């Protein structure tokens, strides 16, 4: 259904 | 900072 | 569908 | 100031 998120933290 | 998002109807 | 995001502050 | 955008349309 939905895939992914949210990151840009650490990486 | 954010980064990503959202999917899985086309893919 | 969407990926991307927002930034340049931190890197 | 900004950088990024929408993607994850053809790629």
Same mark, same amino acid.
């Given at each position: 259904? /939905?895939?992914?998120? /949210?990151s840009?933290?650490? /990486?």
């Amino acid at each position: 259904x /939905i895939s992914x998120x /949210i990151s840009x933290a650490l /990486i």
